[PDB]
Each structure stands twice: as C-alpha cells, then as structure tokens.
C-alpha cells in the first residue's frame, strides 16, 4: 500500500499474507504486524523476521536461544535484515527497513521466531515492479 504492507497473525501459527512484494520505486518499506488473536504473548506471541531464505533456520535457532527480552532475535544478528518486536493478542508493531539491503529478483524469507513457530509461521518477500 505504496511502500507499506500490513500483515496479521492470529492464534494459529499463520500469517494472512504468504507473499509480500516490495515495489521497485521504494527506498524504504514498512511492515505493520498486527496480532488479531486474543492469546497472551508468553503463550502465543508472534513477530516478523526477514532474512535471506538461506539464513532462516540459523536465525530461528539463535533467536529461540535469545529469549523473550530480545524478541527472540539474537542481538546484532547480521543475518537479520529487519524484525518487529514479539507482540501478544490485540497488539501491533511496525518496522521500516531500507530496500537497498535487498537484491532484486532474489527471494527472502519472512518468518516468526517465537519458540516452535519458525517452520510454520513463514512467507516469501520479493522486490518487483
Ligand atoms: Cu508466530
């Protein structure tokens, strides 16, 4: 929605958008994550983490090991292009990142690194015009 997108997660490990396209006129892009469920963040919190499709399992494992105070993302993790905070039901969070961190054509993985969620709660991001 110009250089912005909103994506929702509910009380299942699902994003409502499975693919996001960043328009090639965008220098910055903003993701608004909303958790439209009603469950607590220690029970079913969710975040949105963007990495190259390669770095997903590695970031997810180190992310799980980082703990909730770190929003389940390793601090200063060089492989993380952008990430939101972990939010609970009824909350939302946004993150804006620079599109020149993305190579054209190339597919990126966005996923949730809350414990146990990475393999299910995931999607694809690509740059296109
Ligand atoms: Cu999740």
Tags for this model:
Immunoglobulin-like, 2 helices, binds copper (II) ion, monomer, metal-binding, mainly beta, transport, 129 residues, 3-stranded mixed β-sheet, Azurin
Please outline the helices and strands:
Elements: E1 4-9, E2 19-23, E3 28-35, H1 41-44, E4 49-52, H2 56-66, E5 82-83, E6 92-98, E7 108-111, E8 122-128
Parallel strand pairs: 1-3, 2-8
Antiparallel strand pairs: 3-6, 4-5, 4-7, 7-8
The site of copper (II) ion has 7 residues, from loops.
Pfam families: Copper-bind
Keywords: Copper, Disulfide bond, Electron transport, Metal-binding, Periplasm, Signal, Transport
Protein name: Azurin
Summarize the structure.
Its main location: periplasm. The protein has 129 residues and is mainly beta.
